[PDB]
Amino acid sequence: LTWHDVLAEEKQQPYFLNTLQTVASERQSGVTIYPPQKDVFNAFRFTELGDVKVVILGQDPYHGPGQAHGLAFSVRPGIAIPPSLLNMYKELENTIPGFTRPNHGYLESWARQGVLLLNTVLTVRAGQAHSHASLGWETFTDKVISLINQHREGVVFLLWGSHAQKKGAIIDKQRHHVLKAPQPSPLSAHRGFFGCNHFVLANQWLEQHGETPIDWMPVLPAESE
Ligand SMILES: O=c1cc[nH]c(=O)[nH]1
């Protein structure tokens, strides 16, 4: 069972197709949209439905050049680590044995391990946070989370902030493991994100069920000859 298996019908709904035409229109209208269209669904690309082990919801993609590449909280190599990801790294440094501050903010390696880095809104106009929040994306990501709840077993959900928490309220807390905390953004990180211990708790859960834990130290694609 793949994403395309469970979302094919959803992706033919007017609201959904319509969301994409509005983006494609905006891209040619004189404004820059992040991430590039080939990246918008990268969380799906890197983490197939059956490979989901951990779900980390973000809200809005980063809205600056070079930042957003289709994975919640991640930025491309060579880009400065944004404050929300820095705070994630801080919690990680304080809780995961051996963890040290990465020299990059690129989290593809998380995704390849089964961490679905899913923003609830998948596009944004450059420099304009939540600018596509009423496009239709939230309906789409509602359906995504619902499918995961239904079709998977024992996924760990890390729900950071009221929006993600609301979004994840439908999740079966008996079939899945839901962990709550404030967002890692600067405005709220020190209000409960620090000390939430979510990365360790995630791994303990996975280990309790015979799943291998996440290696949270993110790794840059290597150089070849
Ligand atoms: O993609 C991102 C970046 C920042 N904050 C989010 O919720 N998601």
Short mmCIF file of C-alpha atoms and ligand atoms in Angstrom, two decimals:
data_model
loop_
_atom_site.label_atom_id
_atom_site.label_comp_id
_atom_site.label_asym_id
_atom_site.label_seq_id
_atom_site.Cartn_x
_atom_site.Cartn_y
_atom_site.Cartn_z
CA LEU A 1 0.00 0.00 0.00
CA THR A 2 1.52 3.27 -1.21
CA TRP A 3 0.63 6.91 -0.83
CA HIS A 4 -0.62 6.85 -4.38
CA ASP A 5 -2.79 3.86 -3.62
CA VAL A 6 -4.59 5.69 -0.78
CA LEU A 7 -4.50 9.23 -2.16
CA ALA A 8 -5.19 8.70 -5.89
CA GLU A 9 -8.87 9.49 -5.42
CA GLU A 10 -8.18 12.44 -3.19
CA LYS A 11 -5.77 13.90 -5.72
CA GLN A 12 -8.57 13.97 -8.30
CA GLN A 13 -10.84 16.11 -6.14
CA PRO A 14 -11.65 19.61 -7.42
CA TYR A 15 -10.43 21.26 -4.20
CA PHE A 16 -7.08 19.53 -4.58
CA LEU A 17 -6.53 20.09 -8.32
CA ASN A 18 -7.73 23.60 -7.76
CA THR A 19 -5.14 24.12 -5.06
CA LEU A 20 -2.43 23.18 -7.55
CA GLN A 21 -3.80 25.41 -10.33
CA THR A 22 -3.82 28.39 -7.98
CA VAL A 23 -0.18 27.68 -7.11
CA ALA A 24 0.78 27.27 -10.76
CA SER A 25 -1.06 30.53 -11.50
CA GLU A 26 0.75 32.38 -8.68
CA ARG A 27 4.14 31.10 -9.85
CA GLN A 28 3.61 32.90 -13.20
CA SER A 29 1.90 35.97 -11.78
CA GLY A 30 5.04 37.75 -10.63
CA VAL A 31 5.52 36.16 -7.21
CA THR A 32 7.85 33.46 -6.08
CA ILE A 33 6.31 30.37 -4.46
CA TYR A 34 8.26 28.08 -2.11
CA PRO A 35 9.15 25.26 -2.38
CA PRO A 36 9.73 24.63 -6.12
CA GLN A 37 6.91 22.58 -7.61
CA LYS A 38 9.08 19.43 -7.87
CA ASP A 39 9.69 19.58 -4.14
CA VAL A 40 6.19 20.22 -2.84
CA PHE A 41 5.50 16.55 -2.13
CA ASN A 42 8.98 15.55 -1.11
CA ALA A 43 7.87 14.30 2.30
CA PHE A 44 5.82 11.69 0.42
CA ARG A 45 8.76 10.98 -1.87
CA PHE A 46 11.24 10.20 0.89
CA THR A 47 8.86 8.45 3.29
CA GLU A 48 6.42 5.99 1.75
CA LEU A 49 3.20 5.18 3.54
CA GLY A 50 4.37 1.86 4.86
CA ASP A 51 7.71 3.29 5.95
CA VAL A 52 6.23 5.92 8.29
CA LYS A 53 7.61 5.46 11.82
CA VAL A 54 7.45 9.04 13.12
CA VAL A 55 5.27 11.88 12.03
CA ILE A 56 6.47 15.40 12.73
CA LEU A 57 3.93 18.02 11.66
CA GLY A 58 5.00 21.55 10.81
CA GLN A 59 2.53 24.22 9.66
CA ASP A 60 3.98 26.52 7.04
CA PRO A 61 7.02 25.96 4.79
CA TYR A 62 9.96 28.30 5.22
CA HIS A 63 9.39 31.30 2.95
CA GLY A 64 12.92 32.43 2.03
CA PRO A 65 15.11 31.56 -0.94
CA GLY A 66 16.89 28.24 -0.57
CA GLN A 67 15.06 27.20 2.58
CA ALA A 68 11.96 25.11 1.83
CA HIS A 69 12.50 21.88 -0.06
CA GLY A 70 9.37 19.89 0.86
CA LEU A 71 10.33 18.57 4.32
CA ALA A 72 8.97 20.24 7.48
CA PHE A 73 11.71 22.17 9.29
CA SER A 74 14.52 21.19 6.89
CA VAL A 75 16.61 23.51 4.69
CA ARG A 76 18.88 22.72 1.74
CA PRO A 77 22.58 22.14 2.30
CA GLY A 78 24.60 25.33 2.63
CA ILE A 79 21.63 27.21 4.08
CA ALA A 80 21.76 28.56 7.61
CA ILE A 81 19.88 26.41 10.12
CA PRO A 82 16.63 28.32 10.88
CA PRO A 83 15.75 29.18 14.49
CA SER A 84 13.05 26.47 14.75
CA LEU A 85 15.48 23.79 13.61
CA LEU A 86 18.20 25.19 15.87
CA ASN A 87 15.82 24.70 18.80
CA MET A 88 15.10 21.15 17.68
CA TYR A 89 18.87 20.55 17.57
CA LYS A 90 19.12 22.03 21.09
CA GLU A 91 16.61 19.56 22.55
CA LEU A 92 18.34 16.80 20.63
CA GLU A 93 21.76 17.89 22.00
CA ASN A 94 20.35 17.83 25.52
CA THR A 95 18.73 14.42 25.27
CA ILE A 96 20.18 12.10 22.63
CA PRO A 97 23.43 10.43 23.70
CA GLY A 98 26.36 11.49 21.54
CA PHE A 99 24.35 14.09 19.64
CA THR A 100 26.23 17.24 18.67
CA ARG A 101 25.21 20.34 16.74
CA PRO A 102 25.03 19.55 12.97
CA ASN A 103 26.78 21.92 10.57
CA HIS A 104 23.69 21.90 8.35
CA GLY A 105 19.87 21.89 8.51
CA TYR A 106 19.18 19.18 5.93
CA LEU A 107 16.90 16.45 7.25
CA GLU A 108 16.48 14.08 4.27
CA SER A 109 18.24 11.38 6.28
CA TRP A 110 15.47 11.63 8.89
CA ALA A 111 12.90 11.10 6.13
CA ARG A 112 14.80 8.12 4.71
CA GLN A 113 14.49 6.55 8.14
CA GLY A 114 10.73 6.86 8.33
CA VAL A 115 10.33 10.34 9.77
CA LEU A 116 7.48 11.93 7.78
CA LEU A 117 8.22 15.67 7.89
CA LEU A 118 4.82 16.92 6.95
CA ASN A 119 3.79 20.54 6.81
CA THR A 120 -0.01 20.97 7.00
CA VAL A 121 0.34 23.70 4.31
CA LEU A 122 2.63 22.70 1.48
CA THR A 123 3.33 26.01 -0.32
CA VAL A 124 3.86 29.66 0.61
CA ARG A 125 4.49 32.95 -1.18
CA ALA A 126 8.05 34.23 -0.71
CA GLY A 127 8.43 36.25 2.51
CA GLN A 128 4.74 35.88 3.32
CA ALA A 129 4.00 33.32 6.04
CA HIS A 130 0.68 31.45 5.91
CA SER A 131 -0.09 33.10 2.54
CA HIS A 132 -1.36 29.79 1.09
CA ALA A 133 -3.00 28.65 4.32
CA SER A 134 -6.49 28.93 2.89
CA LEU A 135 -5.76 27.32 -0.50
CA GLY A 136 -6.97 23.79 0.21
CA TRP A 137 -3.78 22.25 1.61
CA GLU A 138 -5.16 21.79 5.13
CA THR A 139 -7.97 19.64 3.70
CA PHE A 140 -5.42 17.50 1.85
CA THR A 141 -3.18 17.10 4.89
CA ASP A 142 -6.26 16.39 7.00
CA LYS A 143 -6.88 13.45 4.72
CA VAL A 144 -3.22 12.38 4.85
CA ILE A 145 -3.15 12.22 8.61
CA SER A 146 -6.48 10.37 8.63
CA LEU A 147 -5.12 7.77 6.21
CA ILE A 148 -2.06 7.23 8.37
CA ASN A 149 -4.26 6.82 11.43
CA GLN A 150 -6.33 4.22 9.56
CA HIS A 151 -3.77 2.33 7.50
CA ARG A 152 -0.72 2.26 9.78
CA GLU A 153 -0.10 0.85 13.25
CA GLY A 154 2.07 2.22 16.08
CA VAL A 155 3.28 5.39 14.43
CA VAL A 156 4.72 7.98 16.76
CA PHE A 157 3.15 11.39 16.24
CA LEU A 158 5.07 14.43 17.45
CA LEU A 159 2.48 17.23 17.68
CA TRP A 160 4.16 20.59 18.25
CA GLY A 161 1.91 23.60 18.84
CA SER A 162 -1.87 24.06 19.05
CA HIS A 163 -2.41 23.82 15.29
CA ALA A 164 -0.69 20.46 14.95
CA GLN A 165 -2.35 19.31 18.10
CA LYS A 166 -5.75 20.21 16.78
CA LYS A 167 -4.88 18.60 13.49
CA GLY A 168 -3.92 15.39 15.27
CA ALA A 169 -6.87 15.24 17.62
CA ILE A 170 -8.53 12.52 15.51
CA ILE A 171 -5.61 10.19 15.99
CA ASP A 172 -6.13 6.87 17.75
CA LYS A 173 -4.04 7.15 20.90
CA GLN A 174 -4.39 3.43 21.54
CA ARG A 175 -3.15 2.30 18.15
CA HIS A 176 -0.62 5.10 17.82
CA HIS A 177 1.62 7.06 20.14
CA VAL A 178 0.91 10.75 20.37
CA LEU A 179 3.32 13.15 22.07
CA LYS A 180 2.50 16.82 22.61
CA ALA A 181 4.64 19.92 23.06
CA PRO A 182 4.83 23.62 22.15
CA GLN A 183 6.39 24.54 18.78
CA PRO A 184 10.20 24.80 18.57
CA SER A 185 9.89 28.27 17.13
CA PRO A 186 11.62 30.97 19.20
CA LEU A 187 8.30 32.39 20.42
CA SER A 188 7.38 29.16 22.19
CA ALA A 189 10.41 26.85 22.39
CA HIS A 190 11.26 27.79 25.97
CA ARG A 191 7.61 27.36 27.00
CA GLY A 192 7.74 23.57 27.01
CA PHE A 193 9.46 22.42 23.83
CA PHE A 194 12.78 22.29 25.67
CA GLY A 195 12.52 19.34 28.00
CA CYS A 196 9.71 17.65 26.02
CA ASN A 197 12.17 14.78 25.41
CA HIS A 198 10.22 13.79 22.32
CA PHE A 199 13.16 12.35 20.35
CA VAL A 200 14.13 9.89 23.05
CA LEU A 201 10.51 9.03 23.82
CA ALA A 202 9.93 8.40 20.15
CA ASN A 203 12.82 5.99 20.00
CA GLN A 204 11.84 4.18 23.22
CA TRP A 205 8.35 3.59 21.77
CA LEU A 206 9.77 2.27 18.52
CA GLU A 207 12.12 0.00 20.42
CA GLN A 208 9.30 -1.31 22.62
CA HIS A 209 7.59 -2.58 19.45
CA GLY A 210 10.60 -4.08 17.73
CA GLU A 211 11.13 -1.12 15.42
CA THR A 212 14.61 0.30 15.05
CA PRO A 213 15.14 3.73 16.56
CA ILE A 214 15.76 6.90 14.59
CA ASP A 215 19.34 8.16 14.22
CA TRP A 216 18.53 11.82 14.79
CA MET A 217 21.95 13.12 13.68
CA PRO A 218 21.19 14.44 10.19
CA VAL A 219 23.58 13.67 7.35
CA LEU A 220 24.53 15.56 4.21
CA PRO A 221 24.66 13.65 0.92
CA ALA A 222 28.27 12.73 0.24
CA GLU A 223 30.77 13.73 -2.43
CA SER A 224 31.66 11.27 -5.16
CA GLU A 225 34.70 11.24 -7.42
O1 LIG B 1 8.76 23.72 7.16
C1 LIG B 1 8.70 24.29 8.23
C2 LIG B 1 9.59 25.33 8.70
C3 LIG B 1 9.26 25.99 9.83
N1 LIG B 1 8.15 25.68 10.59
C4 LIG B 1 7.25 24.71 10.21
O2 LIG B 1 6.23 24.37 10.80
N2 LIG B 1 7.62 24.04 9.05
#
